[PDB]
Amino acid sequence: HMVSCSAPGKIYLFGEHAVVYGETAIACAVELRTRVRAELNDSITIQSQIGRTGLDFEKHPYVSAVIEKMRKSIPINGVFLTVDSDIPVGSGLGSSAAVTIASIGALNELFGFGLSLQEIAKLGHEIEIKVQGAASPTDTYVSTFGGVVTIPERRKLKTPDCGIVIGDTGVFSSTKELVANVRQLRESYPDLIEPLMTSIGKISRIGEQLVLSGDYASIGRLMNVNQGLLDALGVNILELSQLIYSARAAGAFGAKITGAGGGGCMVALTAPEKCNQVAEAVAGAGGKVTITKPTEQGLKVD
Amino acid sequence: MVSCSAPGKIYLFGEHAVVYGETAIACAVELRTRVRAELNDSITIQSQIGRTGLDFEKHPYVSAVIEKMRKSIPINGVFLTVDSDIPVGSGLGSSAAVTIASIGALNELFGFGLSLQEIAKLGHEIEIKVQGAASPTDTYVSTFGGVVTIPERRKLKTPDCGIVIGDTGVFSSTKELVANVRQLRESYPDLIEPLMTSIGKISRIGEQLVLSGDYASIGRLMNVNQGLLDALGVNILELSQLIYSARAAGAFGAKITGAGGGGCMVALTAPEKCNQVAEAVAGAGGKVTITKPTEQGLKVD
Ligand SMILES: C[C@@](O)(CCO)CC(=O)[O-]
Ligand SMILES: C[C@@](O)(CCO)CC(=O)[O-]
Ligand SMILES: [K+]
Ligand SMILES: [K+]
DSSP states (O other): OEEEEEEEEEEEEEOTTTGGGTOOEEEEEEEEEEEEEEEOOSSEEEEETTEEESSOTTTSHHHHHHHHHHTTTSOOOOEEEEEEESSOTTSTTOHHHHHHHHHHHHHHHHHTOOOOHHHHHHHHHHHHHHHHSSOOTHHHHHHHHOSEEEETTOOEEOOOSOEEEEEEOOOOOOHHHHHHHHHHHHHHSHHHHHHHHHHHHHHHHHHHHHHHHTOHHHHHHHHHHHHHHHHHHTOOOHHHHHHHHHHHHTTOSEEEEOSSOSSSEEEEEEOGGGHHHHHHHHHHTTOEEEEEOBOSOOSEEO | OEEEEEEEEEEEEOTTTGGGTOOEEEEEEEEEEEEEEEOOSSOEEEETTEEESSOTTTSHHHHHHHHHHHTTSOOOOOEEEEEEOOOSSTTOOHHHHHHHHHHHHHHHHSOOOOOHHHHHHHHHHHHHHHHSSOOSHHHHHHHHOSEEEETTOOEEOOOOOEEEEEEOOOOOOHHHHHHHHHHHHHHSHHHHHHHHHHHHHHHHHHHHHHHHTOHHHHHHHHHHHHHHHHHTTOOOHHHHHHHHHHHHTTOSEEEEOSSOSSSEEEEEEOGGGHHHHHHHHHHTTOEEEEEOBOSOOSEEO
């Protein structure tokens, strides 16, 4: 009676920060996944990298919210959930959405809730609102369904036959403060910054055709433009620049911040034959590197 | 023994976008080219590069300055000595300065009687002669000085700030960089042309911030301008390291000055944070020049 589910993380090819101002973005699930194993138990126990708890909204807020929410439809007396992940809690890789979706998947399987993927993505959205007070459905949608998806129209795009090199600066990045900083900048210089958001949106809409045609060189070129605009919005840091420039010099098609910035990770779109060379340059410049690829697979019952 | 000097300049905002009709703001800095002009036997010019006569290869600007000027007042012997504090490249203005200082030093030793605008026009056309083509910007800013808007040429109040210039020592072809931006603009005109508009809008806003002395906001707009230059593809790792080191050490702002691809960045700092910023830039590997803005254009020393 041992069930396991996994859900992937994601990167932004284009358009982070500008979505909340009405602009288009392109997200891409990657083959770094969070796994949740679930078992019948006498009590509620959650174990992850930060230890073992019961219901605990300081250490395990997403998993605990999932259990509380789902126990209202089919009562859950006890359960043992074990979480392990390749997604570092730290950047714009979607670690919160992955454990949320994987937790819902595991309990759906274990207790026979019979939820559809669409229902799961919607429930995962509700959980993140519960935990964060407000949240966009994007993270939990991409983790449920995988692949490449535009935001907010949710067009599904051809998954690139590409390497993806993620470089983690190890700097803790607080998404809400960076989002608030960008808002203050926009407020300070509205006629200047709002067109900058339009440009980021334009990049995503150009990028769509390039994703569909598989022009990874052109995609990387536009990723580099996008990186500049993100730098202009104030969310780049020295460590991110160094990883990004080191990836480019090693032959990446393009490299940029993914997610909120201010720390966290960058992403380098790389031909497969150049993944190691790119990864080595990024590690050499001080980055904790992960080599991965896009995935079409969202929530999976392992 | 006559002595004259003219300064270099940095861009506060607007490089790369002037050629697409947008506004820039330049700032003359207290880095100058001093030429001493005196009478001797033969036309002789001494610089760091060495001692020659009329030589349009080794001393192209000084020699072209002598060539044009003797046509209206004969010079048969000069002893022109040239020293400069101005680093080369990065649009810092070393050629414009050596030009203006020479014109004004020969005009002081000999006759001529030029006006300041007269000085600017001859310097600009001397650059035309030597480089083939040339913008009047560098020669005007070197002559009049202070803070100058481009192209409207309005003067603005000199900010009371430190100016840290960090040289990456990386060489870059300005013609090749300008062409790469032009190509990118042609590839994605609907995307890149609005970025050039944004650079101009920064200059329009920054003009008001210079007038009010809001150095903090000037720096913030410098940091936005730098992201746009990075988006246009003219940034590199060494420029970024210097720029972020200056910001973390308290600069109001830091950005590329000039064409990019290498060359120099500039940091605007409070006067009391200037050596702190300079030390951080040097520790990031930059070749640092510490300076400040200058009201003074061409000055008879
Ligand atoms: C920075 C942001 O745009 C994405 C962070 O991954 C925040 C958001 O869109 O909700
Ligand atoms: C890129 C550019 O605007 C700055 C070089 O000084 C080119 C020019 O002004 O001639
Ligand atoms: K959790
Ligand atoms: K120069």
